[PDB]
Here is the input.
Amino acid sequence: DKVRKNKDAVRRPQADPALLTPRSPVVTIMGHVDHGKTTLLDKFRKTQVAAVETGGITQHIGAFLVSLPSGEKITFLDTPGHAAFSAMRARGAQVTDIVVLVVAADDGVMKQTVESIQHAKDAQVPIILAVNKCDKAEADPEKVKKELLAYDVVCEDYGGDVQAVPVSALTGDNLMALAEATVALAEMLELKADPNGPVEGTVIESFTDKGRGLVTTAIIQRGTLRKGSVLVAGKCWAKVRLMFDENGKTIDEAYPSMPVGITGWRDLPSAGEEILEVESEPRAREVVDWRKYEQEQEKGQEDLKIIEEKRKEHKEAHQKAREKYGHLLWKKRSILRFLERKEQIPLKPKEKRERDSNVLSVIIKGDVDGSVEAILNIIDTYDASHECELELVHFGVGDVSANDVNLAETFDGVIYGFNVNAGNVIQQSAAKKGVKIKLHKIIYRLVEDLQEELSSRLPCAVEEHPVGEASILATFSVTEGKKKVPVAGCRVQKGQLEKQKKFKLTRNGHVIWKGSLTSLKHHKDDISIVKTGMDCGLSLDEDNMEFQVGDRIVCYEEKQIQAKTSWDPGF
Amino acid sequence: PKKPNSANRKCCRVRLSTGREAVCFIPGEGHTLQEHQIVLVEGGRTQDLPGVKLTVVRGKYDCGHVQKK
RNA sequence: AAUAGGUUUGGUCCUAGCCUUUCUAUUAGCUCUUAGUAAGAUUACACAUGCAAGCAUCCCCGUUCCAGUGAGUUCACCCUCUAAAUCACCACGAUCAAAAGGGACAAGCAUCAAGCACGCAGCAAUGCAGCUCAAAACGCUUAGCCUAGCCACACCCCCACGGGAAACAGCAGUGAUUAACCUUUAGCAAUAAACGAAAGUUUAACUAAGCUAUACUAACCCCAGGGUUGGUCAAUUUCGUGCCAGCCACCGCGGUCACAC
RNA sequence: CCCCACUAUGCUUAGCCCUAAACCUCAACAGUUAAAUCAACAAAACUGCUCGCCAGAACACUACGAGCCACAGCUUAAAACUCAAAGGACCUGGCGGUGCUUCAUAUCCCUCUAGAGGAGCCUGUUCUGUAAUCGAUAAACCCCGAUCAACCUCACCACCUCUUGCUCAGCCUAUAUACCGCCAUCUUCAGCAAACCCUGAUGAAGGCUACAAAGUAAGCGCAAGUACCCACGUAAAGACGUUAGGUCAAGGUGUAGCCC
RNA sequence: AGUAAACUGAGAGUAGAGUGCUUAGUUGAACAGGGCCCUGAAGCGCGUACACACCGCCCGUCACCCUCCUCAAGUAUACUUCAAAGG
RNA sequence: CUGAUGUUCGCCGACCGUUGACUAUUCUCUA
Ligand SMILES: Nc1nc2c(ncn2[C@@H]2O[C@H](COP(=O)(O)OP(=O)(O)OP(=O)(O)O)[C@@H](O)[C@H]2O)c(=O)[nH]1
Ligand SMILES: *C(=O)[C@H](CCSC)NC=O
Ligand SMILES: [K+]
Ligand SMILES: [K+]
Ligand SMILES: [K+]
Ligand SMILES: [K+]
Ligand SMILES: [K+]
Ligand SMILES: [K+]
Ligand SMILES: [K+]
Ligand SMILES: [K+]
Ligand SMILES: [K+]
Ligand SMILES: [K+]
Ligand SMILES: [K+]
Ligand SMILES: [K+]
Ligand SMILES: [K+]
Ligand SMILES: [K+]
Ligand SMILES: [Mg+2]
Ligand SMILES: [Mg+2]
Ligand SMILES: [Mg+2]
Ligand SMILES: [Mg+2]
Ligand SMILES: [Mg+2]
Ligand SMILES: [Mg+2]
Ligand SMILES: [Mg+2]
Ligand SMILES: [Mg+2]
Ligand SMILES: [Mg+2]
Ligand SMILES: [Mg+2]
Ligand SMILES: [Mg+2]
Ligand SMILES: [Mg+2]
Ligand SMILES: [Mg+2]
Ligand SMILES: [Mg+2]
Ligand SMILES: [Mg+2]
Ligand SMILES: [Mg+2]
Ligand SMILES: [Mg+2]
Ligand SMILES: [Mg+2]
Ligand SMILES: [Mg+2]
Ligand SMILES: [Mg+2]
Ligand SMILES: [Mg+2]
Ligand SMILES: [Mg+2]
Ligand SMILES: [Mg+2]
Ligand SMILES: [Mg+2]
Ligand SMILES: [Mg+2]
Ligand SMILES: [Mg+2]
Ligand SMILES: [Mg+2]
Ligand SMILES: [Mg+2]
Ligand SMILES: [Mg+2]
Ligand SMILES: [Mg+2]
Ligand SMILES: [Mg+2]
Ligand SMILES: [Mg+2]
Ligand SMILES: [Mg+2]
Ligand SMILES: [Mg+2]
Ligand SMILES: [Mg+2]
Ligand SMILES: [Mg+2]
Ligand SMILES: [Mg+2]
Ligand SMILES: [Mg+2]
Ligand SMILES: [Mg+2]
Ligand SMILES: [Mg+2]
Ligand SMILES: [Mg+2]
Ligand SMILES: [Mg+2]
Ligand SMILES: [Mg+2]
Here is the structure.
């Protein structure tokens, strides 16, 4: 039994009824773009962040520990509404206790409102409906309630459990009712978590800070986190160095259902990864070493099937060439092959081959790991590989670095920064190396620019516009310079023919030829443009073309047209 | 390989952290390296491959250990 | 290079390079039980936060030290003369030690062979035309050194009025970067330093701890893994594969009976 | 390369150029023959003293720099990449359009006799052809395995049938490059080899002089004998090795494969 | 040399089958002397970069491929030096 | 006189069998 011992750290078994102590509810504000999710959050946070955003779009998931006037504390996870951030919405629904669905009355149910509802069903979390924008004209709360019925959201008026509170976050009207409804449902849920023992949690965001290092925002689920706690999260472990809140003030303890930024990570955890506390740092490294090994075995088994395929093909080509002759002495086989080796002249292809023009290599750098995963999921929705190929050289979190410039210069790639900066040293180095750093701040802007670079790679789409049409009548053989020149006598019927514009020969609907006239000569005089009804003798540059009495010729003008990428990202 | 050996020895070209592109031998039976991947290279020349002076380290970065049998 | 060994050839002798066996350090793979001790960023790249210089009847004194780093680089040693400082005060001196003067003082390249004012006399005026150099001048490149320790540097412009600009090469920590990666511990109890007449105060110096098989020492009822096994060179059975897949420090092995995969 | 013609050039004068296997590849001066003479070869071995030069091969009588009446030049002269050798002198053998000498005795040439190559047929082979064997295949295959195929022989081809089968099964399946057996070939040869001894400074190696100088040699072959009509001739014999020569299809058999 | 040449018989093996093979006999020659020129052998040398050995080895031109280096038009970038001075 | 050409190869650790089990050479039968 020489198999690695299991040293993983697992979630503690469900807390005993005695241990369970009441805890605060976790709430997520889910909905569609520009339906008021942030504006509603601001009224309860008592702070305005909507105006202080790039484009007024929420592109991050933030957990804020709001304290209600009654004295209760609630954690609000403000999720993004854009289509790109589907993963962020699913992660929010997996750590939440209640989902506050913000369905605007003016617009109603939308594509991302249904997606928000689906995530709640998978997580099995009670939903509280908030009909925002009730003030504006066409704001029908009843229509929203009826439409939600199709998607399995039944309001109380129609006999359902979901609680619908009409609200207007802009004017702060009826917001108290939604706060009361949220508190009521949380008490019905009877949320309780043991506040003692090894800490459990989930990562909400993970990013690199230049001064504080690797930082992960997380929500505690069991136990209490303190300075010096050893934490494992996937393939990364930490010893808690600093615990801070949304405002940066250090917190000494993080009780269950509390948002807490954690520093001290020796590697950057993935967003959504569970956090567990271990006895010591050597134990943490033991747990991480066993998770890395398991990942290497899973990759190894995958690699084995690919290698076995490459090795089976080669062995067939080897058995075939060997069995070409019998099982004779190898001296004879090389001599018999020498007979067919004297007939063999192969050419070795260059070991280093040229990357084709229609190949876009991109380096993706982002401020937070969740932002990078969003861009990487968008790059996985590329379906136009035939026209142009999109290669991902490297992806990471943090500002643009020399390695990103070196990797871009190595593969002639383009660096795309998302809410990240590039210093003068990095920007100057890119100029010398020819790399293009493309810092953005909005995800729809970074995708539009990604599509513009793909379009440039695409081949120029020539546009063929018919210029004229002329039917041949008589074929002449002219002797000029001791050379017999076949001349096609043609009558222009519709349109005109121009010497520059390209031509093509047409036989009873078939396309015989494609090219330009060698000589255009009319009445022994060269005329560049023959009008409709003008007789013109036509000689081609291709002597193999046979001219009949009834052939047709269609002239055309070719104009290259900028080709746009067929790939659409869904927004 | 150079005479008298005959074989198809799996090699790769890699740009080093110093900025010098070099040919590196991949030891073991079967590999899955691809473009854009990260590898650690060590010394030790391939005796029958003229000019091959670098060797990829199996089991580091994206190059994994040889799969048994 | 040694007590040497392998390898040029059809074979011998000679010569010769390469490699082997020895001993360290770093890094990678795989693997790892405990205790004590020692040592511990790849980088003169950029640094969040905290702390690292106070003392004291006001003046002064100290923060010019310790600690750090190795960028630059014959300012480090000896002699002569001689400030500042210690011996309360003069010491009519000793001790310690600058500046100045004299001597000595890394490596590679001579395909760097000439340097271009590099000398001397005179009170001065001024006069003479000399001075260094194949016994290596001048020059380029490389590097901290001669380690009870010393030298140099202290973000850059050798300097630092001025300017660029806003400084961890103090401790802890971090980004980038590299194959290279220690805790955002505690205490001034000991020693050392600063200050005070003193009781004392302060000190990320330092002390006692934290982390890490990099090393050394010791130990453990249970608990061993890594590499190798053709020759050099200690040590292979049964199969599979068939000049393929692969191996090799060197010589070499594998083409259907492989002690070499 | 051979033949003819003719120019630069070789000559003189005046300037240049500054190179040679400019090598007697052996530095100048002094001294020794004493020994521990001495890797080998060459032209014996060394001592004192001094200057010059050298440090794996190749890159390289090259690149760059500098100098020069040199301008497709000369002198000075590296590095990167590459290799595990290059190199010097030998031993033995082979080979030489290699020397001298003596020869060939159906025989190398000039000679002698009858043939083959041309015709038809007979027979073998190669190609082509066929559903339709295999082996031999320069000398040393080709009326060859066969002193022999209409069936049979037979191993081939097509179709059909049998499965512990004539056999305590079977296989003309692969491999003559695993072999025995039996042979071809040099051989129309005379040489192979044990055991010793000696020489070369105890290197691979070598070992004869008859007025003799380091060889002695069992055994094997030649020879001698025997067969046929002699003591002649013809047969027979003919070692060790050479060509992984022929033959797994005489038979046997190692290894691998087949077993409805 | 009873050779070559010509002629005749027999045998092996088959049921039969060869212009083949093995074998007995008959008749029965010519040339045999010069030569070392040609191709070889022996003896004694010479040469050798060959050594599964001349059917050996081997040099250069002319591709693909891989590695490194140099020259180089125009241009750009970076670094170095200045005051170790003068009024 | 002319006489061009011909892709590829050397190392393993051997060396004991013996041989004896029969037990009796001294008849004939007898009860
Ligand atoms: N008239 C009106 N405007 C409203 C109301 N609630 C929100 N808005 C506006 O709607 C716009 C979008 O508001 P946000 O808070 O950014 O909405 P969101 O759903 O969080 O947006 P994403 O994060 O991009 O999904 C802003 O201009 C608000 O002022 C409301 O009740 N009435
Ligand atoms: C040639 O000249 C051309 C032939 C026409 S056939 C109908 N006519 C005018 O140029
Ligand atoms: K918005
Ligand atoms: K080989
Ligand atoms: K040696
Ligand atoms: K004081
Ligand atoms: K230094
Ligand atoms: K400085
Ligand atoms: K103290
Ligand atoms: K070995
Ligand atoms: K000479
Ligand atoms: K010879
Ligand atoms: K004939
Ligand atoms: K045989
Ligand atoms: K047989
Ligand atoms: K057999
Ligand atoms: Mg929002
Ligand atoms: Mg190696
Ligand atoms: Mg040699
Ligand atoms: Mg110090
Ligand atoms: Mg340094
Ligand atoms: Mg003084
Ligand atoms: Mg001084
Ligand atoms: Mg030079
Ligand atoms: Mg330095
Ligand atoms: Mg600094
Ligand atoms: Mg300074
Ligand atoms: Mg520090
Ligand atoms: Mg770091
Ligand atoms: Mg280290
Ligand atoms: Mg005092
Ligand atoms: Mg302190
Ligand atoms: Mg310590
Ligand atoms: Mg290790
Ligand atoms: Mg085997
Ligand atoms: Mg093996
Ligand atoms: Mg003349
Ligand atoms: Mg004369
Ligand atoms: Mg001469
Ligand atoms: Mg000379
Ligand atoms: Mg001299
Ligand atoms: Mg020359
Ligand atoms: Mg030259
Ligand atoms: Mg030159
Ligand atoms: Mg004859
Ligand atoms: Mg004929
Ligand atoms: Mg035949
Ligand atoms: Mg055959
Ligand atoms: Mg054969
Ligand atoms: Mg039959
Ligand atoms: Mg038949
Ligand atoms: Mg058969
Ligand atoms: Mg044979
Ligand atoms: Mg006789
Ligand atoms: Mg005979
Ligand atoms: Mg005889
Ligand atoms: Mg053979
Ligand atoms: Mg030849
Ligand atoms: Mg050959």
